Design a protein around this ligand. Structure first.
Ligand code: LE2
Ligand code: LE2
Ligand code: LE2
Lengths: 114, 114, 114
C-alpha cells in the first residue's frame, strides 16, 4: 500500500525517523514487503477540521485489496496512534480515506500490477 | 464531508476567513454539523488547465453518501461560486472530483465511521 | 483527463515546458482536446518509496472513461517515460493511481459533466 498524510502541523514538528517508522509499521500491519510501501507526509498545510485550526490530518491509504471493515479499523488504530504519538494530533481530528484499488488501475514501472 | 482545493492562486490571495466560510457553507449545504467538516486549501501550486497557467483549481469533495447527479450539480454551483468570488478563479477553470465514500472506508478517531 | 504528480525531486529539477509537455502527451494518448486537460506537479515532497528517499513519485490520473487494462498500461509507459526523461525518476519508483470517474461525479463550470 501507499499512505499520504496532509497536516497543518509544521515541518519542524515532524520527528526524524517518521517516514521510516510509517514504512515499517505499514509493512508489518499488511504482511507486505517494505520495498512496496510508499509514504508521503505534507506538513504546514492551511486546513481546518470542524472550523478549528488545532492540529489535524487528512490522509489516504490505497491498497490492492486487504481493505474492509475490520482491516480498516485496525489501520485506523495504528495510523491515528502514530499521528497522536509522533505529531501530537488528536485521533478525533484525523480522517483517513481508504481505497481498494484494482490491480489494473495501479501504474508502476511502465505498466500496471494487473 | 471534506473539501480540498489545490490552486495556482498565491497564498496572499486567499482571504483570512476563507476556511471558515467553506466550513459554514458546506455545513449548510449538507445539513451536517460544522464540527465534522474538514477543509484544506493548497495555494501557489504549479498547475495548468488547458495548457494555461491562468488561475485554476483542482478540487475534491468526499462525503459518506449525499453524492449524486443533482446534489453534485448543486455542490458545484456553490463551490465554483465561492472560488470565483473569493479566489477570483473562473468556474470553467475548476474541476471537482466527487467521491461517495462507504462509511467503513473512512477512518477517524482510531476506528471507522462504520 | 487530469494528472497530478507528487515528487521529492526539487522544484529546480523540473525543466521548463514540463506542464506543457504533459498536457500535449496526455491529449495525444486519449485523443482528447488539450483545452480540457489539467496537470499539476508538486516537487520538494517529503516522501519515501520502499523505505528509501531516492527520487520517486506518486501520481493520479482521473478520466471520464478511457480507463482500462490496456489503456492504463499504455498511460503508465507514457508517463513513467516522461518522469524518467525529464525528472530522472526511475519507473520502478513511481506509482500512478487510475480513476475512471462517472461524469456525474466531476464538477466543472458550476455544474457536472453528466
Ligand atoms: C502496497 S503493497 N503498495 C504497493 C501496491 C500499491 C497499491 C495501491 C496503490 C499504489 C501502490
Ligand atoms: C462530512 S459530514 N465529513 C465527515 C465524514 C467524512 C466523509 C468523507 C470523508 C471524510 C470524512
Ligand atoms: C480530460 S479530458 N479531463 C477533463 C475531464 C475530467 C475527467 C476526470 C477528472 C476531471 C476532469
Amino acid at each position: 500500500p501507499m499512505f499520504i498524510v496532509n497536516t497543518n502541523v509544521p515541518r519542524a514538528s515532524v520527528p526524524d525517523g517518521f517516514l521510516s517508522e510509517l514504512t515499517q509499521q505499514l509493512a508489518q500491519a499488511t504482511g507486505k514487503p517494505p520495498q512496496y510501501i510508499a509514504v508521503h507526509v505534507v506538513p504546514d498545510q492551511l486546513m481546518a477540521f470542524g472550523g478549528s485550526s488545532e492540529p489535524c490530518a487528512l490522509c489516504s491509504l490505497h491498497s490492492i485489496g486487504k481493505i474492509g471493515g475490520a482491516q480498516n479499523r485496525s489501520y485506523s488504530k495504528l495510523l491515528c496512534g502514530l499521528l497522536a504519538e509522533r505529531l501530537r494530533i488528536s485521533p478525533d481530528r484525523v480522517y483517513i480515506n481508504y481505497y481498494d484499488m484494482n490491480a489494473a488501475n495501479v501504474g508502476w514501472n511502465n505498466s500496471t500490477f494487473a
